[PDB]
Amino acid sequence: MREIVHLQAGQCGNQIGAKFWEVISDEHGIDPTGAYHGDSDLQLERINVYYNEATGGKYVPRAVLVDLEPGTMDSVRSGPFGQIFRPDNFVFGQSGAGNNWAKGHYTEGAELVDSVLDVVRKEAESCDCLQGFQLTHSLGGGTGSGMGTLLISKIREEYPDRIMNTFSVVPSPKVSDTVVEPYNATLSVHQLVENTDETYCIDNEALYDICFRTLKLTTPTYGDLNHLVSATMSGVTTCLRFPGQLNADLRKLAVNMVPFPRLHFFMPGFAPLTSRGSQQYRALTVPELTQQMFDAKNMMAACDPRHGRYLTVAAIFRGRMSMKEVDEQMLNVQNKNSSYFVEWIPNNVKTAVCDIPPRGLKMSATFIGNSTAIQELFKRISEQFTAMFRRKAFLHWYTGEGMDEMEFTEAESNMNDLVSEYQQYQDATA
Amino acid sequence: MREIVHLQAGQCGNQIGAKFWEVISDEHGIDPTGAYHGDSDLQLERINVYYNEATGGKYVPRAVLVDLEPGTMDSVRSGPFGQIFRPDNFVFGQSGAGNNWAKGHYTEGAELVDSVLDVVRKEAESCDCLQGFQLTHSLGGGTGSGMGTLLISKIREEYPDRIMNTFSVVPSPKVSDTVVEPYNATLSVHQLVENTDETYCIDNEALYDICFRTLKLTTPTYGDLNHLVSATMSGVTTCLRFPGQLNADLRKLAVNMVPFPRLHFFMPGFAPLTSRGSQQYRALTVPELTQQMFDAKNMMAACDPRHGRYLTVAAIFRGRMSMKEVDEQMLNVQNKNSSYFVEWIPNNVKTAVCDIPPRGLKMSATFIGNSTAIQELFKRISEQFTAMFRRKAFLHWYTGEGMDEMEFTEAESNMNDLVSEYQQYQDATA
Amino acid sequence: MRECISVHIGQAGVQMGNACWELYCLEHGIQQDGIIPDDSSFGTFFSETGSGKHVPRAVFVDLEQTVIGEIRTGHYRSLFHPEQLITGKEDAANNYARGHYTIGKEIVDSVLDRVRKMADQCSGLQGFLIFHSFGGGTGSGFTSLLMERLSVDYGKKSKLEFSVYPAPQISTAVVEPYNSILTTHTTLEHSDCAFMVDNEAIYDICNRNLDIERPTYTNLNRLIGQIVSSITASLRFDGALNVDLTEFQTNLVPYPRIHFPLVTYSPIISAEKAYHEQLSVPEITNACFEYSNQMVKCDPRRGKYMACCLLYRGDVVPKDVNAAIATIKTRKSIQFVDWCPTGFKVGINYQPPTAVPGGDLAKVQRAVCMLSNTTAIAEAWARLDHKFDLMYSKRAFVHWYVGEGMEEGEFSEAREDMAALEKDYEEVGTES
Amino acid sequence: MRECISVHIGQAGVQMGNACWELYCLEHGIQQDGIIPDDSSFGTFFSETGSGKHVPRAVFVDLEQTVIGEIRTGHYRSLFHPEQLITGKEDAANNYARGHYTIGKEIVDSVLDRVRKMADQCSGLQGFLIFHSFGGGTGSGFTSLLMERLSVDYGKKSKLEFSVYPAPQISTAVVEPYNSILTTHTTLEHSDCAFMVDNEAIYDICNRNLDIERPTYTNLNRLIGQIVSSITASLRFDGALNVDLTEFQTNLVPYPRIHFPLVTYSPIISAEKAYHEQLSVPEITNACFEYSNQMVKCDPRRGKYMACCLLYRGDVVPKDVNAAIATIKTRKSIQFVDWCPTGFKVGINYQPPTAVPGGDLAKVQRAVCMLSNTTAIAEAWARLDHKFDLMYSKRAFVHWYVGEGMEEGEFSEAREDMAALEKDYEEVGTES
C-alpha cells in the first residue's frame, strides 16, 4: 500500500536510478536475481512499496526506464542489478536528443511519450493505493530536461491528486558540462514550477566537495556521487517502508515543507559522512549528527543557506534514538540560528524518526531544507540564459525543432517571478 | 454426445486444421498413431466430441479434409499427425482454383461438392447428438472462399437447426497475398452473412504483431500463427469436453454473442502470451489475464475495438480459479470502459470457467468480442472491391467461369448493408 | 414420517445439491454412501432399504450432462439412485424457450414419473424443495414447466423453491433479464414461497466476514447448504418450538403474488476471529437485520418488513429469544409495515449446526436463520424490469426465443405482469 | 457492571494505548492475551468470552496503517479483536482537512459501527475515553469528526479525552497551530473534559525526577498509562471514597466552554533515590502544586485554580488527606478563585499503583493523581493563537487545507472562537 512508481530519464536518471535500486534492494534483502534472502522480516512487510511480486519469490521493481538512446540502459541491464528490472519497462527510441530541450520535448520524445505512458498506467493500475510518482533526471540534458518535463505534465494531467516528487540534478555554477545548459534549465524549470509537488535540487559540484572534504575520497567516480543521491532518496521514503516512533509520509513532508504552491524546491543532505580513517574519532550520536546536518558544507546543493533564510526544514532520522535528544537538538538549532529561520513561521522544523537504520549504520538522518537562498541558483541561471538569449546564441537549434522565441521569453519571465517570490518571502512581517 | 465435425478447405484451412488436430490430440493424450496414452481419465470421458473410436484403442478424428489440389493434403498426411485421419475423408480434385471465387464455387468445386457431402453425411450420421459443424478456411483464396461457402450453403440447407461456426482467415489491410482478394472476400462474405451462425474473423497481420510484440518471436513461421489460431479454436470448445464451475456450449455462446441474426462476426483473442524471457516477471493470475484479454494489442483481428463499441463479449476461462475474481474483473472492465460497451445491453459479458487448463499452463482464457469496430474491416474491403469493380479490373476471369456482373453488385450491396447495420447499432438509445 | 422431495434443476441446482447432500449425509452419520457405520431421524430425506443402504429422496435433472456426469464419477456416485439422475441431449443454451418448449418437453415426462414413484412411497407428503438458477436455461424454462406440472398432479402440496436471483452488478449471462422475467411470470401462480440468494451478496459475506479472498462456487454452496439444513432442521431434529414447511406459506406470504422472502444466516464467522466473540443470542439476532449480512444484495431499510421467521439452533434459551426480538421491535430504524403488528414467527431447535470438514465456517454453538419478506425487494424487480425493457425495446435477442417454440406476445405479457407485481408491492407498502 | 469504551486515534493515541493496555492487563493478572492463568474486577475494561479469553473494550483507529500493523505483529497481537483495529488507505499528512473531510468520511462509518456493537453490549454505559494527538492529522480532524458523531448517537453520555497538547517550545510539525485551533473549535461543544499533557513537560520530569537522560516515547506513554489507571481505579477497584467518571464533569467544569484541566502525578521518583524518601501523604500532596511536577508546561501560579481532584491510591489515611489539603489551602501562594470556596474533590482507593517490569518508576506505596482546572492554561491558548495568527496572516499553508474539503472562512471562524474562549477565561478569572 502507498506504492511508489519510479520513472527514469536520460543518462543521468538511468545512472542514478540503477544505483538507487541497488541500495533499496540491499536494505530489503533482495538478491540481484530477484530472490529474497533478508534476515529481518520487517524489511519484507512493506516490500510492496517499490516491488511487485511474482512466482518463486521473484520481486520486480515498479520502475520505468526511458531514454531516447538505448546505449545507457544496455549498460544498466548488463550491469549488476540490471536483470532485476522487467524487460517491458525499457522504453526507448533510436535517435537521441542532442542535449537540446526542444528535441526531447516536442520532436523526439513527443512520439515516444505515449509508449511510456502505456507502461506507467499499467504499473500504476497494479497498485492497491498509489502514493505518488518518483522521477530522476537532469535539467541540463536533453532527454531529462525535455522528456522528463513532458512526462511530468502528462502524469499530472492524468493523476492530478497524486504527489509527484522529482530528484533533479541541477547544473553547477563553477563549471558546466553542456553549452546549452541555460536553455535546458530555464525551459525545464518553467515546467517544474507548475507540475510537480516537491523538487530535490542537487548539483554535482556540491557532491564533489562532500567527497573531497568530508569523505576524503581521492578517486570519486559517478558511482560514489550516485550513492549519495541514493541515500537521500531512500531516506525520504523510509516511513512508508519501516515503522518508527514518529512517521513522515511523502505528503506529510510536502504539507510541512511547502508553504506556498510554487516554493517547492528543496536542497537535501545526509549524515553521518566520515572517512575511513576518521571513524574512530567520532561519537556517532544524535548531537553531532544534527550538527553536521545543518552545516552548509554537508549539503548536496551549491547554494549556501547562510545567504538566505530557511522557510521550513525536515529531519528524517533513522535508527533507535532518544526522542528527547532529537527534539532538544532541533530546538537547540532553532534557538542559535534564529536569524536563519523565517520569523512568520513560528516553528520551522518537521521531525520524524524511523526505527530501522541503513545497513552497516547504527544511526542516520536525512535533511531537507526549503531555503530562500535557493534564489541564487535560479538567478544565476537567469543571468546565463539572458546572456545567451540576448543575441540568439543557439536558438536555431531550438526553434528548428518546433519551439518559438516567445516560449523562451515566457520561461525567463516565469523563472524571474519565482526568484522574486522567493526573495519576497525572505523579509519579516510588515 | 454433442459431437463436432470438422471441415477443411483450401491450403489455409488444411494447414490450420492440421495444427488444430495436433493440439487437440495433445490434451486428450492421443498419440500420432491414434493410441491413447493420457494420464488423467477426464480427457478420455468426452473424447467422442471430436474423435470416433475403432478397434485396438485407435481414435479417428471426425474431420473432412477437402481441397481442389492434393499437394496440400499430401503434405498433411506425410507430416506428423497426418496418418491419424481416415483416408476416405481426403476428398479432392485434380485442377485447382486459380484463386478465383467463381471457379471454386460454380465450376471446379461444384462437381466435387457432392463427393464431400457424401462423407459429411456419413460422418454426421455416426454422431449420437450432433452439436454443429466446424469449418476452417480463408476468404482470400479460391477454394476456401468459393468451395467453403458452397459447402456452408449445402450443409445449412441440409441441417437447418445445427450450429455452424466458421474460423475464417480474413485478408489483412496492410499487405495482400492475392490480387483478387476483394472479389473473393466480398463474394464469400455475401454467403457467410446468410448461412452461418458465428464467424471468427482473424487476419495474419494481427498474428504477426502478437508474435513480434508479445511473444517476441524473431522467426515466426506459419506454424506459430496456426498454433495461435488452434488455441482459440480449442478454447471455445472446452466446456463440451471438460467440466467446469460454469459451462458454455457453442449454442450458449451464440445466444449470448449474437443479438441480431446478421451481426455474428467475432474477433477472438487468447491469454496468457509471454516470451521465454519475460515469464519470470509475471504473476500469472486472473487480474492480469483479464487485463491483456481486452488489450487491443492482443487481439487476432486487425480492427481495433477502440474505434467502435462492444455489442457483447465472452470470456471462456480455463484452469481452477476463484469465481469471485473472475466476476469482479469482468465487472471492473465493464465499469472502467463503459464508453466501449453498447448501452442498450445492460450486461455485455458472458462468462465461463473450465476446470482443466491447456497442457503446461496453470491458467488460460479465450476472448470473443462482437464489436461494431468490425465495420472497418468490411468497409475497407468494400473500398477495394468497388475500386477494382469500377473498371472491370479482373471480371473476365470470374464471368467466364459462370458468374455474372449482377452477382457482383448484389454482393457489394449486401456487404454495405451489413456495414450500415453495424454502424446503426453503434448509437445509443433514441 | 415426514418427507421432502428435493428437485435440483440445472447446473446451479445440481451443484447446490451436491453441497446440501454432503451436509445431510454428515448430519446423519452417513458414510458418503447409503451405509451408516456400526442416525435415526434421516427418514425425512433418506429412504431406507433392507440392505442398510439409504437412498436420498432427491431428483437431479439437467438437459446438459456434464455436471451430473461428474456426480456419477464423484465420491457420491454410489449414493443416489441412478434413475434419479436425469440427463438430456443438449442444454438449453441460456434460452428460456429451449428449456420450456423444445427440450423440456422431452424430459419432463421422465422426471415427473420419478417424482411420482417418490410421492407414493412417502407415508405422508409435506412439500417440494426446488433448487434452480434464475439466470436462465434449464433453471428458468424447465422449472416453470415442472412447476406447472407439479401444481396439477399434486395441487395444494407445498412447493418451496431456492432461487439464485441475479445480482445487481455482477452477471454471467447476457440474456438474464429475458429469462428472469419469463420464468417469474410462469411461476407466480404455481409457487408458494421462493427464497432468494445472490452470488454477489454471498461473495461480499465470504470475504467481509469469513476472511477469504478466493471464494469458489463450492464456498457459496456450502453457505446455502447450511440455510436449507436450518429450514428443515425442525423436521429432522427435536426442538423446543418446532416449525413445519407448510407454516412458512401462511407466516411469510400475506398475499398470493407476494411470496419472495430474503435469506440470512447470522454466525458467518471465521474460525480464528470466533475466539474473540461471545456469539450470544441477542447479538446474532441483531446481525440478521444488518445490510452487511443479507444473502441478497437488497437493503432492508430501503423498505418495510412484512414478515420474519427466526429459526434458531443449538444452545438457545427462548427467554433470550424473547428479549432480543423485543429490543429489535423497539428500534425505529427497523421498520415493520403497520398492518402487521404480529411481525415474527419463531422456531427453536436443539441441534447445533454441523461444520463440513474443509469448510470455512467456525464451530459455532448457536445459529439463527432469518427468512424475511420485505418491500425492499421491489427495487430489485424494478431494476430487473429496466434491464429487460432496454433489451426488448431494441429486440436485442428476441429472434433466438421466437424461433424455438415461444412467441413475440409472451414478451409483452410477461413484462406487464411484472409491472403489475411491482405495482402490487407498492399498494401493500402503503396504508390509508 | 461499569464500562469504559477506549477510542485511540492516530499514532499518539495508538502508541499511548499500547502502554495503557499493557498496564491494565498487568493490573488484572492477564497474560498478554485474553487468558488469565490458573482478577475479577476486569469487567470494566475487558469483555469476557466463554473460551476464557478477555477482549479489551477498545477501538484502535488510524488512517495510516504502520502503527496498527505493528500491534498485529506485536506481543498483543492475539489480545485485541481484529475488527477493533481499523486502518485506512493513506494518512492525513498533518492536514486537518484530510482527517475531517476527505479520509475520515471513509472510515468514520466503520469505527462508529464497532462502537455501536460495544455500546449495546454493556450492562450500563458510563462514558468514552478518547486518546489522540493535538498536533494534527487524524488526531485533529478525525477526532472532531468522531466526537460530533458520538455526541448525537449517544447524547449526554460522558466523553473524556486525553490530548497530547502542543509544547510551548518543542514542536514536531510545522502546521500545529492550524490543526490545534481547528480541532478545538469543533470539540468545545462536543467534549466534556479534556485532560492535557505536553511532551516537553514529561520530558523534563523524566530526567529531572527519574534520572534518565534518554526518554523515548515508550517512557512518556508509561507515565500517561499510570494517570489513566488512577483515573479509572475507582471503577476497577474498591476504596474508601470512590469517584465515578461522570463526577469529573461537574467537579472540574464550572462552565461549559472551560473544560481543560491540567494533569499531575506526584510520586514520579527513581528507584534508587526512593530509598532516601519517606513518601508520606503530606509531601506528595504538596508536590502536585509545584511547577516542577506538572505534566503540562504551564505554570499554575501564573493564574488561579478553579477546581482540583485528588485521586489517592494505596496505603492512604483520609485523616492525613484532610490535613494535607488543609495546609495547602492555607498557603497564600496557592491561590484559588474567590467564587469557588469549595475547591477540592477527593478520591481514595486501596489499590497501590503497579509498576511495569522494565519501567522506570519506583515501587511506590501510595500515589496521588491531581486533575486541576486553572486559568493559567489561558496563557497557552494565547500563545497558540499567536502562532496561528502569524501563519494565517501570510496564508502560509492555507492552500493545503482549502484544497481538501475545507474552506477559507473556517480559518476565521475557528480563530475568533478561540479569541472568545480566551476572553471567557479572563471573565471567569475576575470578580466584582
Ligand SMILES: Nc1nc2c(ncn2[C@@H]2O[C@H](COP(=O)(O)OP(=O)(O)OP(=O)(O)O)[C@@H](O)[C@H]2O)c(=O)[nH]1
Ligand atoms: N450459488 C451458485 N450459483 C451458481 C452455480 N452455478 C451456476 N450458478 C448460477 O447460475 C446462473 C445461470 O444459470 P445456470 O445454472 O448457469 O444455467 P442452467 O440452469 O444450467 O441452464 P442452461 O443455460 O441451459 O445451462 C449463473 O448466473 C450463476 O450465478 C453454483 O455452483 N453456485
Ligand SMILES: Nc1nc2c(ncn2[C@@H]2O[C@H](COP(=O)(O)OP(=O)(O)OP(=O)(O)O)[C@@H](O)[C@H]2O)c(=O)[nH]1
Ligand atoms: N506522548 C506521546 N506523544 C506522541 C507519540 N507519538 C506521537 N505523539 C505526538 O503526536 C503529535 C503529532 O500528531 P501525530 O499523532 O504524530 O499525527 P497523527 O495523529 O497520526 O495524524 P497524521 O498526521 O495523519 O499521522 C506530535 O507532536 C507528538 O508530540 C507518542 O508515542 N507518545
Ligand SMILES: Nc1nc2c(ncn2[C@@H]2O[C@H](COP(=O)(O)OP(=O)(O)O)[C@@H](O)[C@H]2O)c(=O)[nH]1
Ligand atoms: N551524478 C551523476 N550525474 C550525471 C550522470 N550522468 C550525467 N549527469 C549529469 O547530467 C548532465 C548531462 O545531461 P544528461 O542527463 O547526460 O543528458 P540527457 O541524457 O539527455 O538527459 C550533466 O550536468 C551531468 O553532470 C551520472 O551518472 N551521475
Ligand SMILES: Nc1nc2c(ncn2[C@@H]2O[C@H](COP(=O)(O)OP(=O)(O)O)[C@@H](O)[C@H]2O)c(=O)[nH]1
Ligand atoms: N495462418 C495461415 N494462413 C494461410 C496459410 N496458408 C494460406 N493462408 C492465407 O490464405 C490466403 C490465401 O488463400 P488460400 O487459402 O491459400 O487459397 P485456397 O487454397 O484456394 O483456399 C492468404 O491470405 C494467406 O495469408 C497457413 O498455412 N497459415
Ligand SMILES: [Mg+2]
Ligand atoms: Mg446448463
Ligand SMILES: [Mg+2]
Ligand atoms: Mg499518522
